[PDB]
Amino acid sequence: ENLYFQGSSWKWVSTGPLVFPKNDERNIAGIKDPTAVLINGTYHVFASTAKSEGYNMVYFNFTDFAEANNAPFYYLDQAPLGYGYRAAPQVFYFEPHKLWYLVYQNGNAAYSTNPDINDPSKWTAPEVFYPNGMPKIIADNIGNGYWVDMWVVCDDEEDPNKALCHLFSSDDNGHLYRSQTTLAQFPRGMSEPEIVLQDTQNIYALWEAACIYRIKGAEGTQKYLLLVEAIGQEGHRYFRSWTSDRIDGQWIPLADTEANPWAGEANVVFEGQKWTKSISHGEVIRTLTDQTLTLDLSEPIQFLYQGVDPNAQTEYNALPWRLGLITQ
Numbered sequence: 491e492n493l494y495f496q497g498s499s500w501k502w503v504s505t506g507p508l509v510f511p512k513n514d515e516r517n518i519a520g521i522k523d524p525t526a527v528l529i530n531g532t533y534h535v536f537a538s539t540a541k542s543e544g545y546n547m548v549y550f551n552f553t554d555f556a557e558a559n560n561a562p563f564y565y566l567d568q569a570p571l572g573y574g575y576r577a578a579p580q581v582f583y584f585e586p587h588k589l590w591y592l593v594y595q596n597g598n599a600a601y602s603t604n605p606d607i608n609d610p611s612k613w614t615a616p617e618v619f620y621p622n623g624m625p626k627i628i629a630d631n632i633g634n635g636y637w638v639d640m641w642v643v644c645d646d647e648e649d650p651n652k653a654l655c656h657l658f659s660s661d662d663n664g665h666l667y668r669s670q671t672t673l674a675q676f677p678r679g680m681s682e683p684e685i686v687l688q689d690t691q692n693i694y695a696l697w698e699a700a701c702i703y704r705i706k707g708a709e710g711t712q713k714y715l716l717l718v719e720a721i722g723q724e725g726h727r728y729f730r731s732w733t734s735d736r737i738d739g740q741w742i743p744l745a746d747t748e749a750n751p752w753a754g755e756a757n758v759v760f761e762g763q764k765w766t767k768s769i770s771h772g773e774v775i776r777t778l779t780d781q782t783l784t785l786d787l788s789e790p791i792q793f794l795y796q797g798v799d800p801n802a803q804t805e806y807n808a809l810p811w812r813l814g815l816i817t818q
């Protein structure tokens with residue numbers, strides 16, 4: 491029963507908007523870039539806060555999607571994680587350390603740790619995966635882009651000296667990069683990145699917000715699923731997809747057009763409130779929470795994403811993003 495690996499015909503239903511910025515003195519414009527896990531009935535979400543003044547991050551939890559908007563926000567600048575530019579989190583449990591990791595950007599590829607996801611006050615001040623700064627290959631190829639959207643995924647090889655931990659990132663210039671280190675060394679020792687995919691003619695076809703997941707029980711050419719956000723010809727965001735037999739393998743398109751996306755306006759049905767034409771920077775809500783980023787596709791995917799009123803006219807950082815949910 492790999493029932494929910496839908497090949498080239500993915501189909502979704504979206505909720506209305508589920509999470510809004512608070513009406514508090516921070517005057518946040520958008521809630522963005524979610525990462526989420528479900529643990530014994532509680533959803534744990536980390537997201538970016540966005541306004542023209544800057545970016546930081548929030549943590550919140552809830553048990554019912556209809557009540558998510560009422561969840562109190564823990565502003566992570568109150569933890570050692572702290573004030574400053576931080577955005578676009580990914581959360582997973584790194585089992586060999588018995589620590590949760592929060593991977594995100596701060597100008598570099600960064601991470602924080604915490605032994606208990608339920609205690610957001612303990613997230614550490616950032617440490618970076620690239621101690622000397624922006625890698626040469628990224629500085630050489632970024633142009634007028636931005637180094638964004640960091641993603642870790644580890645293979646499940648039992649031997650920690652053979653098992654690899656991969657770190658992907660984008661440049662808003664048409665490149666997708668990948669570094670690696672062994673499980674034994676992680677988070678230390680990330681290699682110089684390599685460009686693994688590029689779209690030089692249309693940079694917007696391979697834009698940002700990459701996700702790489704393991705498909706549980708899949709052992710061949712569709713073992714790994716790559717999602718990347720693209721911008722369509724009328725400015726609407728959607729996700730392209732590819733598959734491979736390994737994380738550092740060759741990626742072959744799966745559902746990779748605007749007309750037939752992994753998720754986009756074309757294949758998402760709003761059965762209730764219809765509030766966005768963009769399906770942007772999202773993540774699958776994971777129940778298998780460890781560093782292998784494994785999805786069980788015997789069950790429907792829930793993908794928490796950011797959407798926005800298509801009629802909004804603001805500067806990009808002031809756009810009124812809200813979180814919503816698509817379900818198979």
Ligand SMILES: O[C@@H]1[C@@H](O)[C@H](O[C@@H]2CO[C@@H](O[C@@H]3CO[C@@H](O)[C@H](O)[C@H]3O)[C@H](O)[C@H]2O)OC[C@H]1O
Nearest residue numbers: 544545635636637638662697698721725806807
């Ligand atoms: O503060 C910086 C952020 O603004 C930045 O976010 C990216 C800004 O550019 C976005 O891409 C644009 C989308 O709309 C099109 O019309 C433009 O041509 C694009 O450039 C991108 O999606 C955002 O991630 O990230 C880095 C921050 O320092």
